[PDB]
Scaffold this active site. Sequence first.
Site, PDB file in Angstrom:
ATOM      1  N   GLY A  17     -15.722 -55.875   9.672  1.00 63.72           N
ATOM      2  CA  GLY A  17     -16.733 -55.716  10.698  1.00 63.72           C
ATOM      3  C   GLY A  17     -18.106 -56.035  10.150  1.00 63.72           C
ATOM      4  N   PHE A  21     -20.128 -53.203  13.242  1.00 68.04           N
ATOM      5  CA  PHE A  21     -20.022 -51.796  13.597  1.00 68.04           C
ATOM      6  C   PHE A  21     -20.692 -50.953  12.520  1.00 68.04           C
ATOM      7  CE2 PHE A  21     -16.296 -54.235  14.826  1.00 68.04           C
ATOM      8  CZ  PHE A  21     -16.306 -54.111  16.201  1.00 68.04           C
ATOM      9  N   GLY A  22     -21.038 -49.720  12.874  1.00 68.46           N
ATOM     10  CA  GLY A  22     -21.773 -48.837  11.987  1.00 68.46           C
ATOM     11  C   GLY A  22     -21.051 -48.518  10.693  1.00 68.46           C
ATOM     12  N   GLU A  23     -21.029 -49.493   9.787  1.00 70.94           N
ATOM     13  CA  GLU A  23     -20.453 -49.329   8.456  1.00 70.94           C
ATOM     14  C   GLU A  23     -18.988 -48.891   8.487  1.00 70.94           C
ATOM     15  OE1 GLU A  23     -22.436 -46.507   6.045  1.00 70.94           O
ATOM     16  OE2 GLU A  23     -21.472 -47.149   4.177  1.00 70.94           O
ATOM     17  N   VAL A  24     -18.100 -49.862   8.684  1.00 71.56           N
ATOM     18  CA  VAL A  24     -16.664 -49.613   8.731  1.00 71.56           C
ATOM     19  C   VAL A  24     -15.949 -50.301   7.577  1.00 71.56           C
ATOM     20  CG1 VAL A  24     -14.577 -49.729  10.118  1.00 71.56           C
ATOM     21  CG2 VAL A  24     -16.810 -49.560  11.230  1.00 71.56           C
ATOM     22  N   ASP A 130     -19.180 -51.354  26.980  1.00 69.30           N
ATOM     23  CA  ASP A 130     -19.458 -52.554  26.194  1.00 69.30           C
ATOM     24  C   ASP A 130     -18.236 -53.459  26.054  1.00 69.30           C
ATOM     25  OD1 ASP A 130     -20.852 -54.398  24.659  1.00 69.30           O
ATOM     26  OD2 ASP A 130     -20.514 -53.313  22.782  1.00 69.30           O
TER      27      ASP A 130
HETATM   28  C1  LIG Z   1     -10.286 -62.613   7.821  1.00 73.00           C
HETATM   29  C2  LIG Z   1     -10.863 -61.714   8.895  1.00 73.00           C
HETATM   30  N1  LIG Z   1     -11.714 -62.513   9.788  1.00 73.00           N
HETATM   31  C3  LIG Z   1     -12.978 -62.791   9.084  1.00 73.00           C
HETATM   32  C4  LIG Z   1     -13.696 -61.516   8.685  1.00 73.00           C
HETATM   33  C5  LIG Z   1     -11.985 -61.821  11.059  1.00 73.00           C
HETATM   34  C6  LIG Z   1     -11.384 -60.424  11.117  1.00 73.00           C
HETATM   35  N2  LIG Z   1     -12.435 -59.470  10.817  1.00 73.00           N
HETATM   36  C7  LIG Z   1     -12.213 -58.390  10.084  1.00 73.00           C
HETATM   37  O1  LIG Z   1     -12.308 -58.395   8.867  1.00 73.00           O
HETATM   38  C8  LIG Z   1     -11.859 -57.142  10.802  1.00 73.00           C
HETATM   39  C9  LIG Z   1     -10.662 -56.309  10.526  1.00 73.00           C
HETATM   40  C10 LIG Z   1      -9.614 -56.609   9.488  1.00 73.00           C
HETATM   41  N3  LIG Z   1     -10.681 -55.260  11.381  1.00 73.00           N
HETATM   42  C11 LIG Z   1     -11.781 -55.328  12.158  1.00 73.00           C
HETATM   43  C12 LIG Z   1     -12.014 -54.278  13.179  1.00 73.00           C
HETATM   44  C13 LIG Z   1     -11.190 -53.046  13.252  1.00 73.00           C
HETATM   45  C14 LIG Z   1     -10.033 -52.540  12.490  1.00 73.00           C
HETATM   46  O2  LIG Z   1      -9.496 -53.160  11.501  1.00 73.00           O
HETATM   47  N4  LIG Z   1      -9.604 -51.349  12.944  1.00 73.00           N
HETATM   48  C15 LIG Z   1     -10.388 -50.972  13.998  1.00 73.00           C
HETATM   49  C16 LIG Z   1     -10.395 -49.856  14.827  1.00 73.00           C
HETATM   50  C17 LIG Z   1     -11.340 -49.748  15.842  1.00 73.00           C
HETATM   51  C18 LIG Z   1     -12.303 -50.731  16.071  1.00 73.00           C
HETATM   52 CL1  LIG Z   1     -13.492 -50.523  17.403  1.00 73.00          CL
HETATM   53  C19 LIG Z   1     -12.360 -51.874  15.279  1.00 73.00           C
HETATM   54  C20 LIG Z   1     -11.429 -52.006  14.265  1.00 73.00           C
HETATM   55  C21 LIG Z   1     -12.630 -56.513  11.891  1.00 73.00           C
HETATM   56  C22 LIG Z   1     -13.917 -56.950  12.540  1.00 73.00           C
END
Ligand SMILES: CCN(CC)CCNC(=O)c1c(C)[nH]c(/C=C2\C(=O)Nc3ccc(Cl)cc32)c1C
EC number: 2.7.11.1
Lengths: 266, 309
Positions: A17, A21-24, A130
């Site tokens: 993220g 998102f707020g530091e995930v 959102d």
């Molecule tokens: C190779 C990955 N690519 C480039 C970065 C796009 C996928 N992006 C991520 O690294 C990513 C992953 C592995 N997971 C997430 C978001 C997650 C997530 O992994 N779990 C999860 C739970 C709730 C919410 Cl709101 C959002 C999330 C994101 C933005």
Amino acid sequence: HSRVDPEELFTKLDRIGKGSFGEVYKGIDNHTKEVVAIKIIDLEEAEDEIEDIQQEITVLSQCDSPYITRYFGSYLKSTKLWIIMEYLGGGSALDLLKPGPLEETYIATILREILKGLDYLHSERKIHRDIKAANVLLSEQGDVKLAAFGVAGTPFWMAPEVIKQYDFKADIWSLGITAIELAKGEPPNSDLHPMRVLFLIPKNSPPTLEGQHSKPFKEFVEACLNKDPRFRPTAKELLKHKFITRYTKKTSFLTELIDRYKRWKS
Amino acid sequence: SPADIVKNLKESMAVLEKKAEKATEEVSKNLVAMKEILYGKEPQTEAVAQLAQELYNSGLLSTLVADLQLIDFEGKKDVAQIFNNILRRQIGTRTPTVEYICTQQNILFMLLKGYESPEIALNCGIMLRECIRHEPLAKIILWSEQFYDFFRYVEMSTFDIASDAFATFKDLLTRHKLLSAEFLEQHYDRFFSEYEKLLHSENYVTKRQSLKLLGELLLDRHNFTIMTKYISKPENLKLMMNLLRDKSRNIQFEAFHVFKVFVANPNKTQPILDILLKNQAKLIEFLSKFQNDRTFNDEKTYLVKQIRD
Ligand SMILES: CCN(CC)CCNC(=O)c1c(C)[nH]c(/C=C2\C(=O)Nc3ccc(Cl)cc32)c1C
């Protein structure tokens, strides 16, 4: 269990993220050894009548659906609040657009699953507030789940009645903007300044799907994008729309977009 | 008929406590059935009364709360709505459900113990916070030894819970003021000994939440006797003056809203006065530079006047 520092059971790894998102972080549970997504939010004044934080948490604990990211629990030591949730290593729907454009077979399938997620939230009298491509994520099996943060803004996907001052019909409008976003790669009036957009949405006509696309697609966007919230369909009616009922491709069919990105980044 | 629905749910719960599922299906469907009786198409006035009377005679209320972990997710949420609805049921100037729980006290102790089980802890709070709205039910818990388990629940390090057990902790000490004042009047030594540990807690939330409640309790017109006994002890003044300094801004801010009570006291004692004079000057200077914005200073002047005189 009970009175224990969060790092004793959850460890941190990377940082998904991209500051979005707020530091995930990405993490594992030291007992189950399975992957999870940990969000850390500072509490020490940062804030501190940000206490209503439970709103995001209490609602998340009330959300039980395979179309919404599940909430496993929250822990705190003193400062720094750890919010553990489901992990989706398939990325967001926006990340599947980075390689290239999407065919209408995939788009109709994704919107079918978003509606299912909206069908649950609206039935639970909860509002997502959102809806966009960034908040629509996929697993590795191709399961489409909505986000989590904000359930109870982001201009471009806003509804005109929200800007003027957020009934659930506003999520239908945001879905209509997302429908254009899935077919264009960017929302209408994207190159404009977000503040100017806030001034043009309630005044101008609702955006329209222009170009070389099918009419059921252009009719679907027209149905959602209605400046009168009363005329906007529900999340249950749109599941029966022409554009949705045509393509009956399963969620596992969306694994093609997941693979196209993992090769694009090379 | 509700009488058949109760018996159908009662027998299915006895199955749970592979070949299950059927029971879980029956339990889930029957919990929804009860909900539609209490809420609707508008709930029927006799349908809710036939249901409630069968819940008393069958002892199903004590059964559902006991085996709450065995129920599915949506079921646990439905149980709370069914429980809270009949709890508010009134027959004239009486409340039949409350009178029933007084006869079945373990129902209250079962909900209270629910905080130790995370699976149902959130649900066991929504139902508990409804019971303590009634004074007879809030009294049983308040004078119970299980009430002191709250000091363990408030620092349970499970944020979604913890606070929920704190919202119940406040509602027990603030809602029924005559009931709470009587309890604090008698259990002063033990309660504030436990409460003192919350003010020395390694938890930003717990510390400032307890500091806020402490301000409300002393200032309330019913806890006057408790207040005067608190603002006479030397240590209680020493502690507030210490919290006024380092660490957080909101904490040292709320320390001010309790410290002023010591100063406003027209009946000061010699041990409380020997502290205000041995540290006479520093307070006058610290208050003048006490932080520092948009609210407040009218109080920061009258306090200076008092310490000066
Ligand atoms: C190779 C990955 N690519 C480039 C970065 C796009 C996928 N992006 C991520 O690294 C990513 C992953 C592995 N997971 C997430 C978001 C997650 C997530 O992994 N779990 C999860 C739970 C709730 C919410 Cl709101 C959002 C999330 C994101 C933005």
